[PDB]
Structure formats: structure tokens, C-alpha cells
Amino acid sequence: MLEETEAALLARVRELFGATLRQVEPLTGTWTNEDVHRLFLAPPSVFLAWMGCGEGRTRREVESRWAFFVVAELLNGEPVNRPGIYQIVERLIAGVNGQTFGPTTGMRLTQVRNLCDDNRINAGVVLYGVLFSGTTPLPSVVDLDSLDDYERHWQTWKFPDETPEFAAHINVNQEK
Amino acid sequence: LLFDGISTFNVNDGGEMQIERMITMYRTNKYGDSDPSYLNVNTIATLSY
């Protein structure tokens, strides 16, 4: 039930921030050392990336680890709007803490890394990154449905192969 | 006789005639061989029951 959860977080982010964030888009893979030169950042924007799932309490639940990578612009060594980016990070933490998002519930904040080395400083982007862990259940077993009239019951006693066969072809619903 | 397939009987004291072992005349499987799965009349009777 992970995809429904990520859709829920994305919808919540869109509702909370609206036009403040230029875009929101799921990220394939954690933020590596070349994501800056490969993605359509269009800052300011936030990316939701699934970082996997550790073992949950039961055999039907897991601790999913999501991440929110927030992007902005740092022209001339100066963030484009430092109060804006701080407010974005803070409101993203606040509105996505504790509240359930689809099947997943108990979103708990785990870590916030500055996550701005030279690769991103010379690229004019800040990458404050939030992490989350949630108790998400596994999908249930697929149900079934069929109705066929019970009419015949074929039983075969497991005798030795070449021993003469013993069986009963019951054929219920027979009247005489 | 019990090996051959014909059942037996015992004559106990007092002029009484007992049954000994009732067996079915089944000794050979489909391809020769030797199968005891029907040797006892109790086996076929219990299968029927």
C-alpha cells in the first residue's frame, strides 16, 4: 500500500503549499551526486523519494522510510528567500508529522540533513532534506468468488497401483 | 490351503465346526506378483462398509 501512501503525501503537500512551491514530483532513487545535473529542479520545489522500508512490528506491517528533498536557489551565495525556504521546510515537517496518509499512519520525523555539499552549492541550490518513518501495512490476500453447483463427488481409495481400483463416483443431487 | 486361496476351518472338541480364517481367493496382482490387499474378507467387507 506504498503507492497510495506516496500519493497521499503528494496531495497533502500540494494542498498545504499550493503556489508557494513551483512543483512537486516523486524522485526515483535517493538524492545522489548527479541528481542536480539530471533533474528538472525548477526551484523552489520539493521531491518525495521512497528510501525503503525497515522491518515493522508484525509480519504484515513495515516501517517505510520516506524523504522530502526541498530545493531552492542560492544566487551569489545568498538564498533566494531564506525565510521562505525555512518556512517551507518547517511547514512540511509540521503538516506531515503524526497525520496519517492513506494506509500509512504515525508519520514520525526522524532526521533533517542540510545535505548541501559543493556539488549543490556550485549548482546554486540548497537541498534541505527531511526523513520520515511510517507504520504502513502490507496488502491483504486477494479474495475470491465463484458459485458452481455441487453435483459430483469422486473419491478414489489410494490402493496399490496395479491392485484393482476402488472408487466411488457419488453424483449427488441424483433422485430415484 | 490358506496360501493357495481356499479358506480353512477348525474342528474343535465337542463336534463343533469353527471358521478359522475366511480369506478371499485373491493372491495374484495384475502383472503376476503377489498382493495381500484383498486377502482378508474383513478387508473387502470394511471397504464396502
Curated annotation (Swiss-Prot), chain A:
Offer one example of a GO biological process linked to this entry: viral tail assembly
Q: Name one GO cellular component term.
A: host cell cytoplasm
- Localization terms from the record: Virion; Host cytoplasm
- Main localization category: virion
Q: What induces it?
A: Expressed in the late phase of the viral replicative cycle. Expression of late genes is activated by the viral late transcription activator C.
Result of knocking out the encoding gene: Accumulation of free heads as well as free tails longer than normal and variable in length.
User: What does the UniProt keyword field contain?
Assistant: Host cytoplasm, Late protein, Viral release from host cell, Viral tail assembly, Viral tail protein, Virion
Superkingdom assignment: Viruses
Which InterPro entries does this entry report, sorted A to Z?
Answer: Phage_Mu_Gp37 (IPR014972)
What biological function has been recorded for the protein in this entry? May stop tail tube polymerization by capping the rapidly polymerizing tail tube once it has reached its requisite length and prevent its depolymerization.
Q: Any idea what this protein is called? A: Probable tail terminator protein
From which lineage does this chain's organism come? Viruses, Duplodnaviria, Heunggongvirae, Uroviricota, Caudoviricetes
Curated annotation (Swiss-Prot), chain B:
Its localization reads: Virion; Host cytoplasm
Signal sequence span is none
- Induction, per UniProt: Expressed in the late phase of the viral replicative cycle. Expression of late genes is activated by the viral late transcription activator C.
Q: What top-level branch of life does the organism fall under? A: Viruses
Q: Which family does it belong to?
A: Belongs to the myoviridae tail sheath protein family.
Role played:
Polymerizes as an extended helical structure around the baseplate-tail tube complex. During ejection, the sheath shifts to a contracted form, thereby making the inner tail tube protrude through the host cell envelope.
Designated name of the protein: Tail sheath protein
Disrupted gene: phenotype observed: No tail is synthesized.
Record note on quaternary structure: Homomultimer.
